[PDB]
Curated annotation (Swiss-Prot):
Annotated localization: Cytoplasm
Modified how: Caspase-3 cleaves DFF45 at 2 sites to generate an active factor.
Residues of the full protein shown: 225 to 307 of 331
Name of protein: DNA fragmentation factor subunit alpha
Originating species: Homo sapiens (Human)
Assembly: Heterodimer of DFFA and DFFB.
Free-text function comment from the UniProt entry: Inhibitor of the caspase-activated DNase (DFF40).
Range of residues in the leader sequence: none
UniProt modified residues of type Phosphothreonine: T19
Amino acid sequence: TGISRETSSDVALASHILTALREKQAPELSLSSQDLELVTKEDPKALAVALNWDIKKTETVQEACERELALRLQQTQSLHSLR
């Protein structure tokens, strides 16, 4: 195939995932639990190689992507008022 398909069985990270990673893959809200998870286990060492950029730069995107995952999830947080 050469490309990744919709939510399918264990998909060995196709180039389609590395292409956006190498450029603009959103590991914040654009992905799901397994995408951000598998990526979370795919530290800059490898993930960077796909996005061959400065590790500090590839990490920067990784730092935002994670902080986004928890922030976007906070939507279910309780009200701002206190009892």
